[PDB]
Design a binder for these strands. Structure first.
Ligand code: NA
Ligand code: NA
Length: 327
DNA sequence: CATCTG
DNA sequence: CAGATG
């Protein structure tokens, strides 16, 4: 956790690069286990060979740890951190919409900067365009003081279109967090579930309302159960308009809300622990359900949940207010 | 994983 | 349809 930190970091830099710049998914994946393992390793890695000793740890990495241990740096790391091409690729990727794949193409075409991109808005697709449009806004965190206002709007409008809708804002916003990255809404209706054959309108109706009043301003992607957009809190009395924020809305069958709700609320660590304990108590959990574990190895069957409570209960545990869902 | 693009 | 992005 700090004993082998640099090593784990340098490896992460390397891993990252394999995958992003080169296309070395193999290698990329290589650095990953490696860091994962040295990550757990209880002692102070004093050398290559010592490391090699571990699994995932081959000769080449060993080589690497050596240099880095021997001198405060790595040539390869040093060489990559310069290389304009590599840098471009890490940068373009910042744009919502450009993945690495794209980043390569553009660079090989000479697009390497923000301006580059504007000049060539023709080559970017819609998502990518919105992305470029709101680069800044997009990178800005979201303060809860704003989140609360957003939440206020969305919930009220869903209310109006249908009294029967159930919306919940998950994320860290939910776990207490002072600021967040994007707004994430979980949505269900009574009339939609596991079996119920669809109802797209269930989602599209709400999306519209939200644009009806202008809360939503753009659509990144809109399907029948998941919507990816851009919203914005009405600029008050002109002088201070707000940054544009990423937002998602997704339809969930009422019969799998809470697990999803639970699940999205996180944090990752909370999940895991809860997941393992579930396992203990003779259970299973994933994003949509909790099932009684058979002894034959495993087994299924959907346990029936009416709130985050039914879940906890199930695995017989202390109901956890979202704030204390941390670890 | 669900959506888009081409 | 494969293959990209979030
Ligand atoms: Na991106
Ligand atoms: Na293939």
């Amino acid at each position: 956790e700090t004993l082998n930190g640099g090593i784990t970091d340098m490896l992460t830099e390397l891993a990252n690069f394999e995958k992003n710049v080169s296309q070395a998914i193999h290698k990329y994946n290589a650095y990953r286990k490696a860091a994962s393992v040295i990550a757990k390793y209880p002692h102070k890695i004093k050398s290559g060979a010592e490391a090699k000793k571990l699994p995932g740890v081959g000769t080449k990495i060993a080589e690497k740890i050596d240099e880095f241990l021997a001198t405060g740096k790595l040539r390869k790391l040093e060489k990559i951190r310069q290389d304009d091409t590599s840098s471009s690729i890490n940068f373009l990727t910042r744009v919502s919409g450009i993945g690495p794949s794209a980043a390569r193409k553009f660079v090989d075409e000479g697009i390497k900067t923000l301006e580059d991109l504007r000049k060539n808005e023709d080559k970017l697709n819609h998502h990518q365009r919105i992305g470029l449009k709101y680069f800044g806004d997009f990178e800005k965190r979201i303060p809860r003081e704003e989140m609360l206002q957003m939440q206020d709007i969305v919930l009220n409008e869903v209310k109006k279109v249908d009294s029967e809708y159930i919306a919940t804002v998950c994320g860290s916003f939910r776990r207490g967090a002072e600021s967040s990255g994007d707004m994430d809404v979980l949505l269900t209706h009574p009339s939609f579930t596991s079996e119920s054959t669809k109802q797209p309108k269930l989602l599209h109706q709400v999306v519209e309302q939200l644009q009806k009043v202008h809360f939503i301003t753009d659509t990144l992607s809109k399907g029948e159960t998941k919507f990816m957009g851009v919203c914005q809190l009405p600029s008050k009395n002109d002088e201070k308009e707000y940054p544009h924020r990423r937002i998602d809305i997704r339809l969930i069958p009422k019969d799998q809300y809470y697990c999803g709700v639970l699940y999205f609320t996180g944090s990752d660590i909370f999940n895991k622990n809860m997941r393992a304990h579930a396992l203990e108590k003779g259970f299973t959990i994933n994003e949509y359900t909790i099932r009684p574990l058979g002894v034959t190895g495993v087994a299924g069957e959907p346990l029936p949940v009416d709130s985050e409570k039914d879940i906890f209960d199930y695995i017989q545990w202390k109901y956890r207010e979202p704030k204390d869902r941390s670890e």
